[PDB]
Amino acid sequence: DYRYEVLTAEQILQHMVECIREVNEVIQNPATITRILLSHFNWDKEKLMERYFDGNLEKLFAECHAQDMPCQICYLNYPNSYFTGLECGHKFCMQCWSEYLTTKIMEEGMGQTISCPAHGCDILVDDNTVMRLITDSKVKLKYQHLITNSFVECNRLLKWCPAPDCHHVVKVQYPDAKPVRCKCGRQFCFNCGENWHDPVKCKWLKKWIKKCDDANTKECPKCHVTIEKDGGCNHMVCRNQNCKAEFCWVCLGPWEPHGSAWYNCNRYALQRYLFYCNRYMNHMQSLRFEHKLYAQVKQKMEEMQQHSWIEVQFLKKAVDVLCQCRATLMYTYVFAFYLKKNNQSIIFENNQADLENATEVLSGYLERDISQDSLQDIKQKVQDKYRYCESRRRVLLQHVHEGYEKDLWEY
Amino acid sequence: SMAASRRLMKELEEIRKCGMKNFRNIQVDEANLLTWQGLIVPDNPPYDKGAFRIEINFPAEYPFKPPKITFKTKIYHPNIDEKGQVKLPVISAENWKPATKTDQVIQSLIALVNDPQPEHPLRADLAEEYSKDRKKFCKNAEEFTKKYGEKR
Ligand SMILES: [Zn+2]
Ligand SMILES: [Zn+2]
Ligand SMILES: [Zn+2]
Ligand SMILES: [Zn+2]
Ligand SMILES: [Zn+2]
Ligand SMILES: [Zn+2]
């Protein structure tokens, strides 16, 4: 097994606040400054005490870092009751606070403290009065995330969920580069933090995200009518009267020599990168269109309900198989690009092609050929297809892993 | 987007009523109010032989996000690139305070015009010219100012 546990940003804050207030009884600083101190020493309570007396605190603290008037931010007048302030005596209406704080806790330029909104001054707003002045628990969560990020980075058994508005942490017994699952649903690699990437190792994915950091439409090979891609499937049938021929979108060669021993377009130094990156990026783009299939299938599963919810389950499963396979596929192109060609690589490439074809067939049935088919026939067809897609995917991963157990793979 | 216009309305009312000598010729689209224009008139050489067109652009989220000043007149200054963007520190997203007034923002732009800060520039080569050989730079910027300036 690989056991782990999910905690909320609420819980992971209580953890920190307790870790603060065990230092904070010794050093008697305010709760918010101790946090910034402890953050600076990477939550080593010792290398904090071996500086919080050793040196002059000034160098330490430097290393770490009119009443009946209108509001000076919005210019409207209110009763003095509504004007909150900080320790500087700068006061502002309780809404401008909420608007300032809120827009300050959105990404571009956030560190881990917010200062007073006055011109000039930079007296920090203490953690606890940020929570008190902002309202919506969506924003509040983000703040908690930001002040706790240091605490969670400095701890090697906690990682954040990568999902953008989920602020939960997975907690483990050891780090391993196995897959963990958030409880918003998101499944990620605990070691590297990216999305789960079964065949490729985390190192080679890091290298492939930096190198990849720096065509939406294309023309029919036969009739040259501009085809925008609408759906993730790559078995392209040409929407025309003149030419109703079929062609693989990536290589633009023909279908159906695809899915045979003879023709393989998945097998191939910047000319090379463009080949493998094209297929990765394509499969990624495809995966997005793949997600929007929970709509289209429930329209057919709803139409099958009226002619119920039991059947609707198999089509969801089908789309969930398809998404997982595409995802693997995506990443097999990362793994291959870095691969020194050897005795096992040929067998891998065949499995990659088997999975690629077995995906396109499932992907293209749910996108086109299901509606050109009767109702009693599609339960069997779809099931037989995703069960096969799943085997080819499982065969592929089984193969690389054998190789990894014996260092078969070179780079 | 509306509350911005409401604030700029009051700001713009206080400007045209008290005046800005160094910042003249203020044109704002009254429908919008989020996009002013005007002509800076510096007092120090190497720019006192001309004036410069700036366009201010207030976001919807003003005053909780800062505006963005871009010069339309070309200028020879270490802190303003060729496309017109100015690196004014008080306006950057890190330092911006929603209680900072537009009048202060602009006075601060004329600080920068009248005393170029080569320490954190946009034109790094112009910054070298300014420090390492003042007299020559002041002359280069003067003739650029005379060639591309505006009548006072
Ligand atoms: Zn206010
Ligand atoms: Zn203040
Ligand atoms: Zn999550
Ligand atoms: Zn990983
Ligand atoms: Zn065609
Ligand atoms: Zn192909």
Author numbering:
A (entry chain A): 98 to 162, 181 to 329, 339 to 392, 410 to 448, 451 to 554
B (entry chain C): 0 to 151
Quote the study's own text.
RING-between-RING (RBR) E3s contain RING1 domains that are structurally similar yet mechanistically distinct from canonical RING domains. Both types of E3 bind E2∼ubiquitin (E2∼Ub) via their RINGs but canonical RING E3s promote closed E2∼Ub conformations required for direct Ub transfer from the E2 to substrate, while RBR RING1s promote open E2∼Ub to favor Ub transfer to the E3 active site. In contrast, substrate ubiquitination by HECT (Homologous to E6AP C Terminus)-type E3s and by RING-between-RING (RBR) E3s is performed in two steps. Among the several dozen human E2s, UbcH7 is unique in its ability to react solely via transthiolation reactions, making it an RBR/HECT-only E2 (Wenzel et al., 2011).
The asymmetric unit contains two copies of HHARI each bound to UbcH7∼Ub. Weak density was observed for the two Ub moieties, with only one placed into the final model. Second, UbcH7∼Ub is in an open conformation consistent with earlier conclusions that HHARI RING1 promotes open states of UbcH7∼Ub (Dove et al., 2016). From its auto-inhibited state, HHARI can bind UbcH7 or its conjugate, but this binding does not relieve the inhibition (Duda et al., 2013, Scott et al., 2016). Consistent with this observation, HHARI is still in an auto-inhibited conformation in the structure of the HHARI/UbcH7∼Ub complex reported here: the active site in RING2 is far from the UbcH7 active site and occluded by the Ariadne domain. There are extensive contacts between RING1 Zn2+-loop II and UbcH7 loop 7, with virtually every residue of HHARI's loop extending from residue 230–237 in contact with UbcH7's loop 7 and the beginning of the crossover helix. Previous NMR mapping revealed that the HHARI RING1-binding surface extends onto the crossover helix of UbcH7 and includes Gln103 (Dove et al., 2016). Analysis of the HHARI/UbcH7∼Ub crystal structure revealed that Ub from the UbcH7∼Ub bound to HHARI contacts the UBA-L domain of an HHARI molecule in a neighboring symmetry unit (denoted with a prime).
